[PDB]
Amino acid sequence: LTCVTSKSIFGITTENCPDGQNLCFKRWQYISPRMYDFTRGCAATCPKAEYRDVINCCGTDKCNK
């Protein structure tokens, strides 16, 4: 599995996920009422987000682009 790890106007950076990591993720991390921080990459499991966070996972190449 290959996942996107960063994206902008320049394009995307991708990573061939390590062994056992067969999901891509997108995560919104609550920082404060007016701020969320965004990450995306490879994962082994799709953890349940704690309150105020959102985590979405998928299992096909570059699905988190």
Residue numbers in the entry: 1 to 65
In the authors' words:
The three-finger toxin (3FT) family is widely represented as structural motif, mainly in the Elapidae snake venoms, supporting various biological functions.
Three chimeras were obtained by substituting loops of the MT7 toxin with the corresponding loop from the MT1. These chimeras were named MT7-1/1, MT7-1/2 and MT7-1/3, numbered for the respective grafted MT1 loop. Loop 1 of each of the three molecules in the asymmetric unit of MT7-1/1 superimposes precisely on that of loop 1 of MT1. The grafted loop 1 of chimera MT7-1/1 preserves its structure as in MT1 but does not adopt the same relationship with loop 2 as in MT1 nor keep the relationship found between loop 1 and loop 2 of MT7. Thus a new toxin with novel properties is created by the grafting. If MT7 is compared to chimera MT7-1/1, least-squares gives an rmsd of 3.13±0.02 Å while by SSM gives 1.4 Å. On hM1 receptor, substitutions of MT7 loops 1 and 3 by those of MT1 (chimeras MT7-1/1 and MT7-1/3) have no significant impact on the toxin affinity, suggesting that the seven modifications associated with each of these substitutions were not involved in the high affinity of the MT7-hM1 interaction. Notably, a two orders of magnitude increase in affinity for the α1A-adrenoceptor is achieved for chimeras MT7-1/1 and MT7-1/3 by the grafting of loop 1 or 3. These toxins are characterized by an affinity close to that of MT1 for the α1A-adrenoceptor.
